[PDB]
């Protein structure tokens, strides 16, 4: 998992991204209180993550080195033998991750959730995963809606999104899924001063993605779907 | 936002603020200013040839997969459940 | 307490004030005042109508536990052993 | 696992359970340095939890909505086909969890020590679980006793406590044995003040449960072994 | 060190003090004073002969090892990877 | 995992060991930029924790009863039979641990890393162990380089270490890797004080294990080989 | 005195009133740099400190009873014997204070500046008072320009004003002159809290005495020059 | 305002909050939030029928002073020059 | 001044001494709200600070050595000619302070004030002096309920001391009236800890003055009438 | 006592702990625990024979009256009126 | 030095750090970090052609005087007896 | 004032001027416990101050604008006729003041003292002023050994420094004394750090005024007895 009270998500609370506004509802799952809670893809959010920590050659706002970020993470492993006809109990072709978050129509009473998943693919083919993939929003909105039932917690909105990556012969893979909790530098925040702490979360509250990004000099790494995991 | 206003009402706060150049750091770090915490959604993945090591080889590939993309490279993840 | 008063000689404290309104907070987060903790013994079960998904399966009865007797709802669970 | 010189455990250092001054021994345990160590049902100590946080649908001071809590925790998960005779490797009838907590005799010293257990039923008679589970206490007290050896803790008293739940067919069940580490609010603690921090903790040792509940204006939701795990 | 010198010009530093007599604490632990860390390296085994319960046996095995050589006997030990 | 611009290494940033200047490289692996890493056993940085923390019967700045440490931990469990010659798929006769830590050429950029692995025996003979431990450091050293390519971090020396225990007919045996992060208590620091926290540090930095083991009146533990793993 | 780098003045930097930006120089005083320095009355900023402390039977957020509050204070005392002719040396008819504030050009480099005025009127006529005290303007301005000589430091407006009573027979009378550093009551700030510092300064700053007057539902004290010194 | 921009890159701030309840206090007082100060303007004259004690009478009058208009009444003025 | 909502007085609100409570009114003055306010001596309230902060020779728990501490003070100094008969103006045989704390009836609103007063005795007869200075309660308790009036404070108790030396020939003297402004140090708090610091306040509220002096090992420097200022 | 209960709602507290061994420390200065303060009543008077420097007069009998009775010797004092 | 060694076992600590850019800060104020102080040695004079004021004529060349040699040009002094 | 346990004095214990381990005695003043204390000249502590806050147009680390720095001043003021004959009572031709620093043996028992002294001069040569300053050693030297009595103070070593300044006639002088109490910023203290506090004071303690000038790039306002006062 949860962000709640204490947090906001890149991409959404801070950051925004403007795919997010303009993003449509790929179905709606129904709730506790009887209301329908839109599914939409989580790249819009993905992508915004890229942004702020950069990537590994381009390299920004990433996690300080050595330091402890608690991550609400889970993860899958799996091997795929050298064209092995025996492939064992739980080996396959590919693997794949999965991330959640969804958020609460009242955030001063019940907290956003994150709700993850991580699997093993068995079929050869990529594309008949897709299809999975596509089919496995359908099964997390529903256990979703039944956490939510748990602590009657009411959603608005809930975003999902995968990554997955299929093995050569004789490699494995790892699938991982995370969330990272973390605190932001002022020399990312324009205008902001460790003076002004709280002025500053509200400087990035109000910059949207591409405004913080023309902002600080920064290209787009998201570009036109120019990021896939 | 409108909305922080009736979070401190409360005695909670959404400040995170790293004092570090450049870097993020985590939450419930030292040195961070304020009460709260910022997150994200990450997703990827990452492959390494067999090895007779089952660790090592989950090692790296988890490796590869927190420097896809979104950088979390050196980090040491604690976890959340 | 009487052992408290040993306790502080040795620069310990059994301290742990959460600032929110109603609410607790975990051991180690920022805005807590003192440097101790309070524990409890919770144990519960919860159940799941058995789906294609060993992992989200896990989930939801991990939460029914959660949210059964005393209640641990929304909570980030990390884990010491 | 452990708490130590830094806490206190609900309803025995503080917000004392009048069912722990009654509370009367099962059996004991053999330690290292041949005191023989008393242990007890964990019940009370377990209700008293309930009465603090309350419960989903009469909430008290749970954790806060998203809050970070750290946990000594463990658990276990198992599955239960459609009445299917060929129930698999790790399947099972029902799930069940520990909880023990062993009060050092010198608090500066040695720290009290929480030991967990979990595990699945392979029996259909719940009335045959009990039995085992009133067997575990044995095990478990084994352990604590062996653990105590490694330290040279002694401990004068040891509660442990379970839970369990039987699944439908086709039904898969999750058993946890947690301990969280909080820290109290101000509204629980009567007379109570920010600015007064150390006075706050005296209060709640001072106070027992019913004291507190009536000086709270709560109901008992222990009540009369209302409560079951 | 001069190293130091260099990591406190980008916010970083490594003090890491404990305000108790005797003994460490965690990272992160309230009261600590600094927002450094230090560490070292344990690798150690232990033993116990075999009881119907994998959980115990994981456990006082677990403890054995904690408990031989270096000590680290009764710590909350929280999970880093 | 890691350790970076906020910590340092017991025997090697401080405290360190005179074996750590005497030692000489076992080997070397290539690394992303050509240079040879050398490899080294970990052994004086093992023996070194163990005079600062102290062993279970001669306790020194062990961490607090009940404190919570956080640590870059891994671990395998395995059993042995009494005698039984069907192993069933994961037992084993012995179980081992190894720790690696790979130090950064330029520390203020690249954080300094630790690769952990564990594993199982299968054969009953010890001296066929050692064997086997020598060539995990190829392994490692090998995940190592290939970990430091993903981050583009260069270490300019890594230390291995291993751990075991071979099981009784009937005993099940727990192999553990821990790097623990900690903070140090004044008493420990010659000349400290609670008021000179930065100072207290540099005491820590200057003084080599003898020289602290001498200042503090301590016996060395690690005397001549006097520690095993 | 001096405030600089670190404050504001009510009814100038903060609850600033719109007699400030109506007002009309009375003079100028030619500054080292060859400026000419406009002289105001303070009235304005009088009346503000008013609105914002209360008065004695309407108080408002004055200072805590029994605080240390640091002024730059000066003062003068007199007494008027029961109309003896001979008044002996320093006595008198009537008793004076003046308050300065001249705000810096550049508040970066140079500190705004609070000269301080008191003395004892001689002849029985308030009305030529009255002109005495039109005229110390011009005594006061010179010695302003005077000090921003010694320093090199720049105003851009200078704002006088003044206190006066006249005794009766057998009366001792204390004519004061004092700034007071304060630091302001979350109560005071509409929509302020204690975990906004920094918002709640600009709060303030961004509210006019009126608006903050009507937000918080205070009469208006200085109404229509109802204030008398 | 744009001016505390500048300040802050100074390491100075005009913060100064008090955590009272409707009170103000002081500069430098413990508990106040911040490193800066507000002032104000104050000039007011206050009277006293003579006695025989010229301190006595500095005393009230400059007690009626501090409570005539606005008030500064049970304060403990220091001062600066 | 003053002394408030933050303060206590030693001798009377904490380290009471039993003078205090046995302690009969020399008289009473009327205030604005028409009660009658008792006048006291302040020997109980002067002794019990010497018993605190300790003598030259027999030092306690006195300020720190270069310590700043901030003192609601007055003084006076005049000098006494080698028997010359013209002694010029302000010069005198005698000088004498005095020191005067009301408390409040309601410490929450008003504060409890200081008045202090100091003054030179023209008359050489030093049993004279002793009238006027009984008499000067008097004039001390008549600007007290006139402050009083002015801030609408209503107090309920007011104690009154005096301090005086004769100078001798060609002798000068200084008489100083002088209420400090402190903190506690933890060994001056029986059972007291730094960690404890509402519980340390609280400890010295409830001890009374003989046993503190008891409790910490210190004989009564105040003895019977011993001290004489 | 009962009455600060009533302060502590005003967000008032009369603690005021020196951290110094056996010493007190006046009101406001850095590291003293607290945000209230505690006081007495002194009055003294002490001599020096006439030199022909007034302000060393006044120094020395002024510094004869801080160490008579209550000592109060080599403080800086600062005045509140 | 070794004197601060000894200071320390007492609870003292002469460390005074301004968190400013060039300039020095007084004893007392906030944000300063530590719990000591550091001072000096200033005499000088300044003059002022008389005026009918002798209270301002006192300001001005009690500015003159600040001004001089060692600069401490625009402070609020407080005084320390 | 005293400057005791808590500081250190520009010039001496930081940042120590050459000329002070060259500077020999003018004299000897008996002390209370029969140790002859040493006088110098203050010259060199007094050019000290003025190297670190640099002069008012060549600025260095002199106070910030509008701080509240506390002082241990004192001054006289005095004005001079336009040549009239009557002088009145307290008018003079030149005013002057001192300060005199006095180092205790033990800093952990007793506070190093300050006394300081002003007054104005009566006849118009400065040549015979300058014979009475070099007399008022004497003058305070006998005060502050008087005062070391008082306390049972022994002092090691005492500066003592004068100023002055002739009026013209119908002009006024003011000479004043001062010692600021202050904290150092950071980037005067070579190789300092925010972060490394108390090693920031070692630093300056280990430099020697040249040192430190040489080390800034400051150029040595003290020249050759360039400063006069
Ligand atoms: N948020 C966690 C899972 C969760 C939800 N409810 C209880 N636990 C997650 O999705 O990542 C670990
Ligand atoms: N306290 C932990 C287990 C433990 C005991 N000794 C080492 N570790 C637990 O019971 O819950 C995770
Ligand atoms: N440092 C961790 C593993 C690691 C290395 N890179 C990512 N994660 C470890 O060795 O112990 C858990
Ligand atoms: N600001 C002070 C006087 C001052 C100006 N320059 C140095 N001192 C004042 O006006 O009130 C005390
Ligand atoms: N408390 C001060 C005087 C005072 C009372 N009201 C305003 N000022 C005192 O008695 O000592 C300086
Ligand atoms: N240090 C003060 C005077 C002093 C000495 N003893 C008590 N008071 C000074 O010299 O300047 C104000």
Known sequence: XFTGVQGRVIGYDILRSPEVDKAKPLFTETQWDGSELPIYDAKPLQDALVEYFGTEQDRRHYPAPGSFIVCANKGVTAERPKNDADMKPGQGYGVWSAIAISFAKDPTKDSSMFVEDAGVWETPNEDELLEYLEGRRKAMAKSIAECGQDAHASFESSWIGFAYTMMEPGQIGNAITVAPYVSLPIDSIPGGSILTPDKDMEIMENLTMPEWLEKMGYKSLSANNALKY | ?81
Not at chain 2, 24 to 52: F, H, Q
């Open chain 2, 1 to 81: 936002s409108e909305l922080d206003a009736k979070l401190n009402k409360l005695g909670v706060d959404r400040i995170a603020i790293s004092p570090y150049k450049q870097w993020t750091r985590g939450y419930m770090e030292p040195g961070n200013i304020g009460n709260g915490y910022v997150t994200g959604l990450k997703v990827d993945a990452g492959v390494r040839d067999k090895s007779d090591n089952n660790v090592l080889d989950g090692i790296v590939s988890y490796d590869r997969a927190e420097t896809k993309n979104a950088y979390i490279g050196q980090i040491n993840m604690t976890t959340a459940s």
